[PDB]
Design a protein around this motif. Structure first.
Motif, short mmCIF file in Angstrom:
data_model
loop_
_atom_site.label_atom_id
_atom_site.label_comp_id
_atom_site.label_asym_id
_atom_site.label_seq_id
_atom_site.Cartn_x
_atom_site.Cartn_y
_atom_site.Cartn_z
N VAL A 139 0.81 -1.20 0.00
CA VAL A 139 0.00 0.00 0.00
C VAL A 139 0.85 1.26 0.00
O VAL A 139 1.76 1.41 0.81
N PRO A 141 0.53 5.79 -0.88
CA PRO A 141 -0.39 6.92 -1.06
C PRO A 141 -0.62 7.38 -2.51
O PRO A 141 0.31 7.39 -3.31
N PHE A 192 -3.89 12.20 1.26
CA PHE A 192 -3.59 10.97 0.52
C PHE A 192 -4.58 9.89 0.85
O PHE A 192 -5.32 10.00 1.82
N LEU A 193 -4.60 8.84 0.04
CA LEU A 193 -5.42 7.69 0.39
C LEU A 193 -4.89 6.36 -0.15
O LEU A 193 -4.16 6.33 -1.14
N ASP A 194 -5.24 5.28 0.54
CA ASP A 194 -5.15 3.90 0.05
C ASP A 194 -3.70 3.68 -0.48
O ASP A 194 -2.81 4.15 0.21
N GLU A 226 -6.67 -3.75 0.99
CA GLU A 226 -6.19 -4.85 1.82
C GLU A 226 -7.22 -5.96 2.00
O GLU A 226 -6.89 -7.04 2.49
N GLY B 48 17.76 -10.60 -2.10
CA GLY B 48 18.57 -9.50 -1.64
C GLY B 48 19.02 -9.77 -0.23
O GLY B 48 20.04 -9.27 0.22
N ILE B 49 18.24 -10.59 0.44
CA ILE B 49 18.50 -10.96 1.82
C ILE B 49 19.81 -11.75 1.90
O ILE B 49 20.01 -12.71 1.17
N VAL B 50 20.73 -11.31 2.76
CA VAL B 50 22.00 -12.02 2.90
C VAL B 50 22.42 -12.26 4.34
O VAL B 50 22.72 -11.32 5.07
N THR B 51 22.46 -13.53 4.75
CA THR B 51 22.76 -13.85 6.14
C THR B 51 23.47 -15.16 6.33
O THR B 51 23.71 -15.91 5.38
N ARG D 17 2.39 -4.53 7.82
CA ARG D 17 1.36 -4.59 6.81
C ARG D 17 0.14 -3.74 7.14
O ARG D 17 -0.67 -3.45 6.26
N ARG D 20 -1.39 3.11 6.90
CA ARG D 20 -2.23 3.85 5.98
C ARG D 20 -1.67 5.24 5.76
O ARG D 20 -0.55 5.55 6.16
N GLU D 21 -2.45 6.07 5.10
CA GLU D 21 -2.09 7.46 4.93
C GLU D 21 -2.10 8.20 6.27
O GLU D 21 -1.36 9.16 6.45
N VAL D 34 15.40 -7.74 9.84
CA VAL D 34 16.24 -6.99 8.93
C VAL D 34 16.60 -7.87 7.73
O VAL D 34 16.76 -9.08 7.85
N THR D 35 16.71 -7.23 6.57
CA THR D 35 17.22 -7.85 5.35
C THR D 35 18.48 -7.10 4.97
O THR D 35 18.66 -5.96 5.41
N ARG D 36 19.33 -7.71 4.15
CA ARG D 36 20.69 -7.23 3.97
C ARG D 36 20.75 -5.73 3.68
O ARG D 36 19.98 -5.18 2.90
#
Ligand code: ZN
Lengths: 277, 89, 272, 77, 277
Positions: A139, A141, A192-194, A226, B48-51, D17, D20-21, D34-36
């Motif tokens: 998601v 804006p 903004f929205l969504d 969503e 992209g993940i590296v561990t 996840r 919102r705005e 965390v990712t690299r």
């Protein structure tokens, strides 16, 4: 410089009054034990509780008033009536209620149509589309309405910019900047929205393999954001529109140009979502 | 990392990893088990993940001798398909 | 006689030559029977036969006028079959209640004009002609919307007047509509409001049974239109008829320049 | 000559996840793996020079609308 | 500013020598009358010009005077220029009626026929600078190599026509006819090329013909016509595909035969464009 004046909207006003009166008046079939009073006034009043700034009304109810003759203006010509259905609805709320973003989502359409049955006559019109979701996205804006100015240099104009370009603000300014100049981007004044895109695909039971089912884009704008899930069939509100895109070398062409080029494709919109299917 | 997830090894860390029929395993897995036993950690470089995840698991295995019950008087390493270096572990 | 450009297929001539074509078996070596079947269903899309005009007289020449110049001939043929519907109705007096059924759109779907040999054999000298083709379909592209009637807007006042596309181009008046108002400011083209018409695209290998062997077959992308769109899936080895088209492509990139070698695709007016 | 405050837990406690705005411009807690990570590339921040306009702060993150003499860099990641 | 330096070769009187080469002939009535008229009769397109006979003609024009400037060396020395020069001469000597030509008959010939009819009529009415010679052809001029059994005349070094290696090819052979040999590679499938493509205007009509030169050209709009121009204001104009003259175009690359490759290196392909017949 006075703007004289504005024109004419004709039928748009008739649909404004009809829709306003419809959302106002019953809209009630059942008697005795109801399901009576109102239900839409009671809908807005129930909505006053959480103030999530969306409404739900049935299309079947809307067809009952004029015998479907009201629903026709709201069918094929529908997108013409989007700015009218919103502000109009606000003219109701201002009367019955005390920061305004309103997402109208119709539902319960008389007949569900497949993605294969999608035609260029169905544009600007509510159509229910059933099929499995593929490739949901994160998601982000939308600019919605923006103040981008000044724009040379003090103007601070906040208006319009609702259509998707997003270019540009600062045109026919200030009065009077005469920009040109910078755009200029201001994101603090712009609500903004969504939204999240999902790529909808036809269900596998209908498609006659060898088929190679044809997916199509549906972007979810609205609070139905969503609500969609990957690997499952969903029913949407149509608002088919179109979106501009860069096609591969041989199209084969050649679509026209706008001259003092344009390449378009069907991108379906949904302002309402349900898990049905 | 599939449209992140560990294999049995990562998931089972400190615990007990239980595998059977090595002989039927595709090499792609074989290298993974070998690495796990060797350095006690699984490294993932994609996407992209590296561990380096840490699997400290005790491996318990069930293996099936090549062919018959006792394939030969010949030594165990000869008796079964699994290479000698993985077996030394 | 109303000469029309270089196609030189005369209006108010061939219309009547087709109008008296009606009511024939004849010959053969249906015709009005199938049309009388057509009028009830409202399915439109008259499939014709081809060959009819050949060897039949009159209109021995009309077959050659269509074959050599299908572009106009199909439009005129549609007008004439429409007015022959109009003249069919007045014969039975009040029909179908009433005049609205005539207003509905009709078209001719010609097919099987001569036997053409492949795509491969084709000369660059014939670019407006009806051309048989055969081969499997590797893919059916998603539907692209096509301009029919364009819509326009301005900051003033705003006014809703709009103009049709006609030929494959779009010219909006600089200034302005209604009135007046003016000013010089550029027109605002609403993207979604304007009308659209279905244009698919269909890839076709050239007759994999007929090949240089071992060279892989050549692609022919036939773009169809209207009802024909999404009427097929893939791999259909049968046959297709339609008008050949060479249209310029935009190259590198940008630059607004033409690659000067026109790509070629088939309009495919009919499928069978 | 600058100390920016850390500000411990602030529920909220929106996860990932769910966003919102309504969260724009407003401080919000987030959590997850965390990712690299990119390597440490000094960002421009403050601008200064011997003259020769004055110090120009840019930015987070635009930079519109270069000199350098002694500029105070701050690591970005 | 762009200096000039004279050369002994002059195309002016060489054209004259071409004209004396055509339609005045003995050794093979003459072959250039019949071979030309059969094209004019429209059963034939390709005009195969043998350099052998050009060789035969000089003997009659030298020894056997009166002596003249040489072609066979001067042709293959350039060989591009003669396609636009040696071939245009055919226009001056060609039989006019020629026989039973009619109009339709042929597709697209009626177009230009009506062009010149309406042009003649409207011009003869207006007086009460012409369509380019390359649009009206419907035939192609092709030279052929002299191997030759009669090359033993002898003009010796005159022959290329030397069935050379792809390796033997040099940057000093550009703009000079050269035979090559090898296996056909990739043999791209035929597509239409373009030559004139006279776009059609709208209001006051006329025509304009844009030359197709080199590989590509830039398309133009404006208005060229003086009538639509400035009053009022600039007439709109589109290209008409029926009116255009199309020449088949097929390209193919040719790798060396590999026996012509030394102990080292690699097979080297050479790109070859094809036209007309
Ligand atoms: Zn003109």
């Amino acid at each position: 410089l006075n703007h004289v004046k504005k024109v004419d909207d004709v039928t748009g006003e008739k649909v404004r009054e009809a829709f306003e009166q419809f959302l106002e008046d019953f809209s009630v079939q059942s008697t005795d034990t109801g399901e009576v009073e109102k239900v839409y006034r009671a809908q807005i009043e129930f909505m006053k509780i959480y103030d999530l700034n969306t409404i739900y009304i049935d299309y079947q109810h809307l067809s009952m008033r004029e015998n479907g003759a009201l629903a026709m203006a709201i069918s094929e010509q529908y997108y013409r009536f989007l700015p009218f259905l919103q502000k109009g609805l606000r003219r109701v709320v201002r009367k019955y209620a005390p920061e305004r973003v309103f997402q109208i989502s119709f539902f319960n359409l008389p007949t569900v149509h497949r993605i294969r049955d999608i035609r260029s006559e169905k544009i600007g019109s509510l159509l229910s589309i059933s099929g499995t979701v593929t490739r949901t996205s994160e998601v982000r804006p939308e600019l919605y309405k923006a103040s981008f100015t000044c724009d040379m240099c003090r103007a601070i104009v906040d208006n319009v910019e609702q259509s998707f370009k997003y270019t540009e603000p600062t045109f026919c300014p200030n009065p009077s900047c005469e920009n040109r100049a910078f755009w200029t981007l201001n994101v603090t004044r712009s609500r903004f929205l969504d939204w999240q895109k999902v790529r909808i695909q036809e269900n596998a039971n209908e498609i006659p393999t060898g088929s190679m089912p044809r997916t199509l884009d549906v972007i979810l704008r609205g609070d139905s954001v969503e609500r969609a899930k990957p690997g499952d069939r969903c029913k949407f509100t149509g608002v088919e529109i179109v979106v501009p895109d860069v096609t591969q070398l041989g199209l084969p062409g050649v679509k026209p140009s706008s001259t003092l080029d344009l390449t378009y494709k069907i991108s379906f919109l949904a302002c309402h979502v349900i898990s049905i299917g | 990392v599939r449209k992140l997830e560990g294999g049995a090894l990562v998931l089972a860390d400190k615990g007990v990893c239980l595998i059977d029929e090595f002989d039927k395993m595709n090499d792609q897995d074989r290298t993974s088990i070998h690495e796990a036993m060797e350095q006690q950690s699984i490294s993932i470089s994609k996407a992209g993940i590296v561990t380096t995840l840490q699997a400290r698991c005790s491996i318990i295995a069930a293996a099936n001798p090549n062919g018959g019950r006792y394939n030969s008087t010949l030594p165990l390493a000869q008796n079964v398909s699994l290479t000698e270096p993985i077996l030394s572990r | 006689l109303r000469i029309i450009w270089g196609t030189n297929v005369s209006i108010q001539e061939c219309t009547t030559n087709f109008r008296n074509f009606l009511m024939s078996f004849k010959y053969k070596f249906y015709y009005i029977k199938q049309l009388n079947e057509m009028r009830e269903l409202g399915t439109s899309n008259l499939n014709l036969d081809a060959r009819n005009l050949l060897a039949y007289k009159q209109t021995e020449d009309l077959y050659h006028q269509l074959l050599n110049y299908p572009q106009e001939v199909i439009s005129i043929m549609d007008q004439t079959i429409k007015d022959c519907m109009v003249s069919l109705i007045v014969d039975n007096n009040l029909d179908y209640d009433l005049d609205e059924i005539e207003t509905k759109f009709y078209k001719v779907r010609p097919y099987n004009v001569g036997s053409c040999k492949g795509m491969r054999e084709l000369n660059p000298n014939d670019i407006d002609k009806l051309i048989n083709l055969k081969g499997l379909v590797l893919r059916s592209t998603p539907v692209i919307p096509d301009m029919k009637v364009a819509f326009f807007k301005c900051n003033v006042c705003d006014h809703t007047m709009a103009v049709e596309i006609d030929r494959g181009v779009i010219q909006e008046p600089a200034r302005c509509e209604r009135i007046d108002c003016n000013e010089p400011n550029s027109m605002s083209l609403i993207h979604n409001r304007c009308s659209f018409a279905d244009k698919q695209v269909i890839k076709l290998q050239e007759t994999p049974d007929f090949v240089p062997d071992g060279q892989t077959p050549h692609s022919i992308s036939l773009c169809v239109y209207d009802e024909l769109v999404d009427s097929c899936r893939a791999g259909d080895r049968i046959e297709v008829t339609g008008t050949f088209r060479s249209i310029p492509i935009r190259a590198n990139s940008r630059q607004r320049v033409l690659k000067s070698l026109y790509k070629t695709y088939v309009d495919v007016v009919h499928v069978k | 000559s600058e100390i920016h405050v850390r500000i411990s837990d602030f529920p909220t406690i929106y996860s990932l996840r769910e966003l919102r705005e309504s969260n724009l411009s407003s401080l919000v807690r987030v959590t997850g793996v965390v990712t690299r990570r990119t390597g440490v590339f000094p960002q421009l921040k403050y601008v200064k020079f011997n003259c020769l306009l004055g110090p120009f702060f840019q930015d987070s993150n635009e930079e519109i609308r270069v000199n350098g003499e002694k500029t105070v860099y701050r690591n970005y990641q | 500013a762009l200096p000039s330096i004279q050369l002994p070769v002059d195309y002016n009187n060489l054209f004259n020598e071409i004209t004396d080469f055509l339609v005045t002939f003995k050794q093979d009535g003459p072959k250039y009358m019949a071979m030309l008229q059969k094209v004019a009769n429209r059963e034939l397109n390709s005009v195969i010009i043998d350099l052998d006979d050009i060789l035969q003609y000089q003997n009659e024009k030298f020894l056997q005077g009166t002596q003249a400037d040489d072609l066979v060396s001067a042709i293959q020395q350039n060989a591009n220029h003669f396609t636009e020069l040696f071939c245009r001469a055919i226009d001056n000597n060609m039989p006019l009626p020629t026989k039973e030509i009619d109009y339709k008959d042929d597709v697209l010939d009626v177009i230009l026929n009506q062009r010149r009819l309406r042009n003649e009529r409207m011009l003869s009415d207006r007086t009460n600078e012409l369509f380019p010679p390359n649009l009206t052809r419907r035939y192609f001029l092709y030279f052929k190599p002299l191997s030759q059994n009669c090359a033993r005349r002898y003009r010796k070094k005159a022959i290329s026509s030397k069935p050379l290696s792809v390796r033997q090819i040099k940057g000093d052979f550009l703009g000079q006819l050269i035979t090559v040999r090898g296996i056909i590679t990739r043999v791209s499938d035929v597509k239409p090329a373009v030559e004139v493509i006279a776009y059609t205007c709208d209001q006051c009509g006329y025509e304009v013909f844009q030359e197709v030169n080199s590989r590509t050209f830039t398309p133009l709009s404006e208005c060229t016509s003086e009538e639509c121009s400035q009053n009022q204001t600039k007439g709109q104009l589109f290209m008409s595909t029926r009116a255009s003259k199309f020449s088949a175009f097929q390209e193919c690359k040719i790798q060396e035969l590999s026996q012509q490759v030394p102990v080292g290196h690699i097979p080297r392909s050479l790109n070859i464009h094809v036209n007309g017949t």
